[PDB]
Amino acid sequence: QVRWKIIESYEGNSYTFIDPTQLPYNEKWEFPRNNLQFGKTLGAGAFGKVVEATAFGLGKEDAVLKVAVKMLKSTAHADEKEALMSELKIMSHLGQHENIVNLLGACTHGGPVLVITEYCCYGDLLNFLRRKAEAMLGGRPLELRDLLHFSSQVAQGMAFLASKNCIHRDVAARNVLLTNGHVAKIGDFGLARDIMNDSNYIVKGNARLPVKWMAPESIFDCVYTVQSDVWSYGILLWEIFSLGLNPYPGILVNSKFYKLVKDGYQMAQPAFAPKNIYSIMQACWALEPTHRPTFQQICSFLQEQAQEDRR
Template sequence: HTAMQYTSILSLIRLKPSEAGRYSFLARNVGGWSTLTFELTLLYPPEVSVKWMHINDSNILLCEVSGYPQPNVTWLQCRGHTDRCDEAQVLQVWEDSHPEVLSQEPFHRVIVQSQLAIGTFKHNMTYECRARNSVGNSSQPFRMPSRGESPFLLPLDESVFTPVVVACLSMMALLLLLLLLLLYKYKQKPKYQVRWKIIESYEGNNYTFIDPTQLPYNEKWEFPRNNLQFGKTLGAGAFGKVVEATAFGLGKEDTVLKVAVKMLKSTAHSDEKEALMSELKIMSHLGQHENIVNLLGACTHGGPVLIITEYCCYGDLLNFLRKKAEAMLGPSLNPGQDPEGDTSYKNIHLEKKYVHRDSGFSSQGVDTYVEMRPVSTSSTDSSEQDMDKEASRPLELRDLLHFSSQVAQGMAFLASKNCIHRDVAARNVLLTNGHVAKIGDFGLARDIMNDSNYIVKGNARLPVKWMAPESIFDCIYTFQSDVWSYGILLWEIFSLGLNPYPGILVNSKFYKLVKDGYQMAQPAFAPKNIYSIMQACWDLEPTHRPTFQQICSLLQEQAQGDRKERDYTNLPSSSSSGGGSGSEPEEESSSEHLACCEQGDIAQPLLQPNNYQFC
């Protein structure tokens, strides 16, 4: 084995008093450890202040000196009034070898005081206090009055000096208050950070987390930034934006691919740049999966960091569902605003009963609805015309089940990689060709300062309505807390994009409802079995919630199992199929296969009771 040598440098620029002290360096490897300790003390030149006191007919001069190392104090007496005693004027010299130590904090300046009793008042004299140490020297004279002047007039200089000091101190106090206010505002300002957390190992409740800044970056992801042609902005937030782009030669030299590129604003701070680089390293560490917004490349040299990801043509799932709801519900849709400003859909009265049969769905109501049709299987090479046709197709129950299953598979993949998402919501799911759902983290391009879904809690903005109780009250994030959030996402899907807990403001009453086990009602388009999954996800005991692998299995059973004698709510459309009461759609030979994710509980080693990840 070859011995390795590393050099670690600690740079302290413009040392502050608080940085003085004892420093220790620790080096450790499998063979043992070693430490090196040293003390760092700041050096200060002397600062001198002289005061006169008249006590019991005795005149006393006090000289207060601060500095480090401890200064030596010398008194001089000279003729006349002067700013500094020359050697020719000096009448007498006193060395104070043992001044009184007023303050001596470790690693900081020493404050000493020297007294000179001058006895009877001697007119037209100057007394000077000099202080010296290895850093420098300083002095201050004190002039005695001439004959005819009262010694008590001498403090007039001090009376002029005192208001100046008071004014300066007041100004400094105001500036300090302003500085503290600005610092508070800066601390309150949200900072860009990667929501995803990866656990490296654990022992009981002691966790070792992967520091994303220490993850390696493989240069295979590097892509020439000159080969990117930027288009429109897909989303922009307080920290950066996501831009549509065309990549030339990504993968193969002759390929032209539409991609999405994440980038920071030009005003980004160093910690935000580090956070974006950490996001890049996490994405490369996780690997590829069909239901994750996958990394395609990156530009880290010769300019700002750019992260190149898959482009998802249908945008985020939340807005997709809301647009579909507007198109399908037509007159029965009355968009309104809930107390937090999110669009909600009012007056949706669905009292029709739909009984599922082996052949499909049959309606028993007075209204007519669009015929249920097979799900389109458009590929990534579909033309824009095919995409438009697919986009205009009304949603069916199988679509909602399809979205739910794909998100569950993506979350199961993250869990198998020991990755906790911490912001599972429909707004963080994108849809691409074939309505494939992909999970991502889009905090970079979201203005959380003005997003009512993110509530101020402490010095952070959190998606409280999507968070599990243990995350809200104890700042605990686990796979089980992601399952709770997934249950909220299911509610979003089967309500066609309504805001969770409609009509309920996030306040003390909301927190009490969550703590007491309040659960939202069954959404309008959710089958009973799907609502049962939601309720299981919202169990107050984290270990009683299903795993994502179990959710995959439950959704597969919902899609493929025996559906006889089960009641469903169909999705109405503004366009009629032409039938009236009792009309039936054509029979379909088979339902869409929703593949259960392959990861089992064994792939989620940290899903054990009370094994929590703390933020």
């Protein structure tokens, strides 16, 4: 599936004390439903939708501020309701981070469940990159430092998720939002996503899966770990440094594609990727999951590349 999920892991430095999806919910997040006014839809899919809203008296500082609200369609089945409560429980457990779309509140009584999160004013990274690529063909252009920042910001978010044993399962430039200062943030964006009508999501029987982004062990063996997410981050880095090309350009998803990937096929270096950045992608794409870098290793290598650019 493409929802965030806490996994049980002791390998290395992580320690699972509790799975927050196993327990009911923390009523500290409750917020008055009548103190939201809804605006336009930011996105929608099969069972859910996200709308921008103003929240009146949210948090200790009693601020008025613009937020995003996630909710199910009235047509949603119980399993969809459960999945939303699960996401709320995970987000209540993770704690805040600058590169996550943070939870701010929920409304879980007196009507349908609303999940209130930070609002990101610049929209998705992929469309941002594609507009900056388009501009080159006919304001200010991107620089290497901007692409390094985006890469670092996402890797810091992912390093945070990894430290809490949270797997993402849909890492892709389309699932990165940009907020004030064009800082990147990640979140579980499944509800905003029209997955059933998106050709990037391939039928795999029960499921619709972002196969071009997925580790071989995820595709073949239904294994889903942090190191699976590392593979996907490599695909994302390719998207960033290509200014938003579609992965595996012109290659159809089918049996030849699965065999390519299993046999060690890797996308070519993007035009705007330095060799050192391509080396991150190649490492993320190690066929053996244990030979891939950790998100912390990625973060600390990217921080060196950033210093070099600054010099």
